[PDB]
Design a protein around this ligand. Structure first.
Ligand SMILES: CC(=O)N[C@@H]1[C@@H](O)[C@H](O[C@@H]2O[C@H](CO)[C@@H](O[C@@H]3O[C@H](CO)[C@@H](O[C@@H]4O[C@H](CO)[C@@H](O[C@@H]5O[C@H](CO)[C@@H](O[C@@H]6O[C@H](CO)[C@@H](O[C@@H]7O[C@H](CO)[C@@H](O)[C@H](O)[C@H]7NC(C)=O)[C@H](O)[C@H]6NC(C)=O)[C@H](O)[C@H]5NC(C)=O)[C@H](O)[C@H]4NC(C)=O)[C@H](O)[C@H]3NC(C)=O)[C@H](O)[C@H]2NC(C)=O)[C@@H](CO)O[C@H]1O
Ligand SMILES: *[C@@H]1O[C@H](CO)[C@@H](O)[C@H](O)[C@H]1NC(C)=O
Length: 377
């Protein structure tokens, strides 16, 4: 059992995975409580009044999704509420919050009251990101860095005496870490730091690449866009290994390549991949969408034999990179070799939780659990 091991397994739950057809539908009651130590609810958002509020009142309040996920505290799981996420981070509203001490002070007392109203064990900060709003470092003032660290302090100072948790999901990008994160404050005050060691590559690159390389690979354009560098950078900036939980994607980045004859790594790309039937977003595919394309639509799989990264798969002008059970066992032995706090997945509902592909229910997340519980490194 994961609850009696030295590792965390932090699972993100997403309230919008309810709005999916057929087998893609995911509800609170689909959470498998033997697969996580911590569940993080994505996402609450920052309202116009500068206070945390439900992103989707229909599901969160009227259909009691908050209460239905906080349910799993009954199995010994810690359930936190995440604030922010990519789409809530598009503007300046978090920056206006953290640069204003009176707004932070109001925000903080209300936030803790919100968490306790619904029974949450903690808060997860997912502002993407201080200074580099949606990764654009020219957007935010440098004082976002100190503002966010002061927010984290002011949150910790009220949460910690109550026994409540404070964590954050943070960029894997060297440039964002340098510009927006006061790493020693974060490392000292957070119960864990969920490093989002994925989305290194995607349609924005105008070229094919892997969503989540583990190690540097010789054809890479940078030495720093891989989990191994990102994890060592966080520790080098001052993070104790035990605070790091390493992010792993349950989904793939998809691309439309510019001609179907070329189909390897780093080949030109005109757009994101075609949207999946269930996730309905150009540019990505859930693992259960990918594994079905491979098993039944004849997509070809190319594994990396050096095992610096997971596979990619292509058909015609469609190309997707993703993690398979093999690279995940490698990532988890890596987690164990560095004595990291544990692993994190984005997200429960993107793994093959219905066993649509014949490898078992939740093949990726079971692979993580099994490797985390295996004593050999
Ligand atoms: C260009 C240049 O000059 N420089 C480049 C750099 O750009 C480049 O850096 C890269 O830059 C890209 C951005 O272009 C970054 O990509 C971002 O990476 C982040 C990770 O650090 C991602 O954020 C985290 O992880 C996940 C993704 O894995 C995030 O998930 C996303 O979350 C949002 C919510 O915030 C989800 O949005 C939900 O979307 C669905 C639609 O799909 C909505 O669904 C609808 O719901 C309503 C009701 O609610 C319903 O009625 C509708 O029917 C329904 N519709 C459908 C179709 O279903 C939801 O409502 C909505 N939810 C909310 C709350 O709004 C989104 O789907 C989800 N995506 C996935 C795949 O799950 C999550 O927020 C983050 N948190 C955590 C804990 O994981 C971010 O996703 C990603 N952005 C994009 C655009 O992909 C790269 O990180 C960055 N890389 C690096 C290394 O920095 C660099 C490097 O390449 O190079 C420079 O030079
Ligand atoms: C991982 O990173 C560290 C420091 O950046 C480096 O010393 C080590 O050799 C890297 N491992 C691989 C396999 O690239």
């Amino acid at each position: 059992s994961l609850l009696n091991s030295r590792y965390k397994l932090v699972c993100y739950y997403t309230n919008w995975s309810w709005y999916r057809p057929g087998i893609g539908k995911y509800s609170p009651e689909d959470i498998d409580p033997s697969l996580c130590t911590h569940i993080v609810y994505g996402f609450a958002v920052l309202g116009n009044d500068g206070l945390m509020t439900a992103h989707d009142t229909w599901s969160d309040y009227d259909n009691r999704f908050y209460e239905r996920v906080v349910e799993y505290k009954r199995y010994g799981i810690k359930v936190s509420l995440a604030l922010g996420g990519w789409n809530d981070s598009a503007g300046d509203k978090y920056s206006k919050l953290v640069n204003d001490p009176a707004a932070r002070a109001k925000f903080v007392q209300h936030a803790v009251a919100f968490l306790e109203k619904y029974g949450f064990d903690g808060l997860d900060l997912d502002w993407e990101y201080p200074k580099c709003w949606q990764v654009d470092c020219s957007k935010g003032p440098d004082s976002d860095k100190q503002g966010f660290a002061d927010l984290v302090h002011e949150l910790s100072a009220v949460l910690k005496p109550k026994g409540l948790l404070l964590s954050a999901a943070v960029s894997p990008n060297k440039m964002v870490i340098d510009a927006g994160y006061d790493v020693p404050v974060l490392a000292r005050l957070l119960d864990w730091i969920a490093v989002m060691t994925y989305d290194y590559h995607g349609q924005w690159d105008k070229k094919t690449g892997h969503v989540a390389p583990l190690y540097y690979h010789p054809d890479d354009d940078t030495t720093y866009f891989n989990a191994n560098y990102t994890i060592h950078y966080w520790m080098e900036k001052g993070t104790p290994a035990s605070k790091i939980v390493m992010g792993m994607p349950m989904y793939g980045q998809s691309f439309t390549i510019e001609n179907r004859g070329i189909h390897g790594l780093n080949i030109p790309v005109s757009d994101g991949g075609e949207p999946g039937e269930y996730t309905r977003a150009k540019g990505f595919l859930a693992y259960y969408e990918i594994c079905d394309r491979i098993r039944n639509s004849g997509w070809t799989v190319v594994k990396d034999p050096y095992q610096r990264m997971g596979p990619y798969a292509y058909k015609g002008n469609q190309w997707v990179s993703f993690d398979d059970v093999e690279i995940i066992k490698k990532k988890v032995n890596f987690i164990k070799s560095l004595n990291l706090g544990g692993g994190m997945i984005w997200a429960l509902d993107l793994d093959d939780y219905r066993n649509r592909c014949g490898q078992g229910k939740h093949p990726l997340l079971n692979a993580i659990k099994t490797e985390l519980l295996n004593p050999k490194i």
